[PDB]
Amino acid sequence: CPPKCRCEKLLFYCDSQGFHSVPNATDKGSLGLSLRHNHITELERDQFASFSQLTWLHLDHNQISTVKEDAFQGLYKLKELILSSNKIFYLPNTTFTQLINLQNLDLSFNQLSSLHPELFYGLRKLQTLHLRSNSLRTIPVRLFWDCRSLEFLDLSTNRLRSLARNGFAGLIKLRELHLEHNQLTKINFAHFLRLSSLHTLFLQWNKISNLTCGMEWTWGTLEKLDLTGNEIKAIDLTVFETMPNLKILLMDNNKLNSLDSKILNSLRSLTTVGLSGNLWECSARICALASWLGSFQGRWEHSILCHSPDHTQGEDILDAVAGFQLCW
Amino acid sequence: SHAGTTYIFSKGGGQITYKWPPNDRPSTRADRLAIGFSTVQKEAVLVRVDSSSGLGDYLELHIHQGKIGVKFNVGTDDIAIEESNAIINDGKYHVVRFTRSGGNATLQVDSWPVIERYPAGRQLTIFNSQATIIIGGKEQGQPFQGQLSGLYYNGLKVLNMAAENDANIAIVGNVRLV
Ligand SMILES: *[C@@H]1O[C@H](CO[C@@H]2O[C@@H](C)[C@@H](O)[C@@H](O)[C@@H]2O)[C@@H](O[C@@H]2O[C@H](CO)[C@@H](O)[C@H](O)[C@H]2NC(C)=O)[C@H](O)[C@H]1NC(C)=O
Ligand SMILES: *[C@@H]1O[C@H](CO)[C@@H](O)[C@H](O)[C@H]1NC(C)=O
Ligand SMILES: *[C@@H]1O[C@H](CO)[C@@H](O)[C@H](O)[C@H]1NC(C)=O
Ligand SMILES: *[C@@H]1O[C@H](CO)[C@@H](O)[C@H](O)[C@H]1NC(C)=O
Ligand SMILES: [Ca+2]
Ligand SMILES: [Zn+2]
């Protein structure tokens, strides 16, 4: 066993030592390797050539800034690669293609600004992909073409300006998608047409003004939609016709003014809703919403309060409806 | 037995007022008002909290026929609660406590049975954007004459704040800080 490193088995645990590069190994039949919280700044070509039998490799919290081409070559049996919390900003297009049995890839908390359209080609056994907390501004249309068995994708905390029409091609088995804390402006749900297995979609804390749906379709698998903390003021009357099995809808802290009865009549499978913090106008317009609440049989965690006119501010909708003779 | 910060409201009428900053005028779902007083008057208005310009919301504490009471409005309608079992204008010190939870109200004279009053149905719960506290009831045409101590309104010791020459406070009329 190499110096400064304790080895429980074929697993090598080399966390929290002052390693500026990967140590050469007396035993090359190691199954796992941990190099966490060292100060590695560079990954050489064929650096892990000795560790052929590696199944998981942890390189998190290192100052890695440059990754040479063919850095991970020969790691055919590798199924987990953690590269989070580094200073990586460029990745050669051939850097992951050899790693066929990869299942979990973490590239979060890095300085990536863009990704090569063929970076994730040939990762068919990939299940989870963490790209959280990067400075990506755009995303290649073909990036996920080969990601057949991916079911978790994290793109939160980036600088995504907007969504490509068919960027998601090949994510047919994706279940959970994280797009929160980006900089989206509008949402055209026709853009998610290719994600036919999605059950949860997180879009909170963007800058979303509009909710539209260009192509009519049925997203039968979507069950949870989190839109908390955007700037939503307008919603096309058919965007929830698309999600018949939607059971959790969160739209707190937006700029919603009211809701058409056409909208609310589609949201009947809901078990949980969130409508707090919106700019509700308490007048005859909210009757659609007020009546729905009486009819509703699901739950809502926080009370829904009027914002306009001023004399109704902060008062629960139903209390204000019955108190001011607004309906019926 | 009356000790605490106290103001003498003598003949001619008097008034202590507090002005909230324009932006921070609070809204409250519940209110807690406690005042220490002594008087011999048959009719007067002790404290009144009025909403900002353009709002009908208000809270008024007053004496009518020697009986202490409270009248308030969340927006829509007036709600009244009064201690009618007995009299408080005997000249001795009393502490009356008022409590509001939305439509509900509570009155309790010092060391007497508590009065609880619950409105029917569902009421408006919010007292909306409080602008001023007017202690004295001069502007209502029923100025108070006597001594007021330990006034408490939603965490504010207003009289104590007047005795500390708070910048917002405006002291007018025949009022003395004994
Ligand atoms: C205002 O008070 C009402 C009613 O007070 C109830 O009646 C009394 C006899 C006493 O038993 C009180 O403790 C009761 O609360 C409140 O409405 C009730 O609230 C409780 C608790 O939330 C609930 O169990 C009852 O079903 C409610 N009854 C009705 C008719 O709605 C109300 O919560 C109070 N409002 C505020 C803002 O505090
Ligand atoms: C470590 O490996 C490098 C090649 O990557 C080689 O040049 C060097 O001599 C090796 N050192 C030891 C001590 O094995
Ligand atoms: C790698 O990138 C170059 C761009 O210079 C591209 O032409 C080439 O096809 C890419 N190779 C693979 C295997 O993706
Ligand atoms: C969103 O819709 C509103 C009205 O429906 C429109 O005025 C606005 O321009 C739209 N936003 C964008 C970014 O197109
Ligand atoms: Ca009010
Ligand atoms: Zn070092």
Numbering used by the authors:
A (entry chain A): 34 to 361
B (entry chain B): 85 to 262
What does the paper say about this structure?
Neurexins (Nrxns) are a representative presynaptic organizer family and interact with several different postsynaptic organizers such as neuroligins (NLs), Cbln1–GluD2, and leucine-rich repeat transmembrane neuronal proteins (LRRTMs). LRRTMs are potent postsynaptic organizers that have been shown to instruct presynaptic differentiation. LRRTMs have a leucine-rich repeat (LRR) domain in the N-terminal extracellular domain, which is followed by a single transmembrane domain and a cytoplasmic region. Here, we present the crystal structures of human LRRTM2 LRR domain alone and that in complex with human Nrxn1β LNS domain at 3.15 and 3.4 Å resolutions, respectively.
We thus replaced His355 with Ala to weaken this intermolecular interaction and confirmed by SPR analyses that LRRTM2H355A and LRRTM2WT have similar affinities to Nrxin1β (–S4) (KD = 4.3 µM and 4.0 µM, respectively). We finally succeeded in the co-crystallization of Nrxn1β and LRRTM2H355A under the condition without malonate or citrate. The Nrxn1β–LRRTM2H355A complex structure was determined at 3.4 Å resolution. Nrxn1β and LRRTM2H355A form a 1:1 stoichiometric complex. However, Nrxn1β binds to the C-terminal cap of LRRTM2 with a buried surface area of 448 Å2 in the present Nrxn1β–LRRTM2 structure. A calcium ion is coordinated by the side chains of Asp141 and Asn212 and the main chains of Val158 and Ile210 in Nrxn1β (residue numbering is based on human Nrxn1β (–S4); Fig. 2b). Therefore, we concluded that LRRTM2 Glu348 interacts with the calcium ion via the coordinated water molecule. The comparison between the apo-LRRTM2T59L and Nrxn1β-bound LRRTM2H355A structures (rmsd of 0.42 Å for Cα atoms) indicates that no drastic conformational change of LRRTM2 occurs upon binding to Nrxn1β, except that the side chain of LRRTM2 Glu348 flips towards the coordinated Ca2+. Apart from the Ca2+-mediated interaction, a hydrogen bond is formed between Nrxn1β Arg206 and LRRTM2 Asp352. Phe357 of LRRTM2 hydrophobically interacts with Leu208 of Nrxn1β.
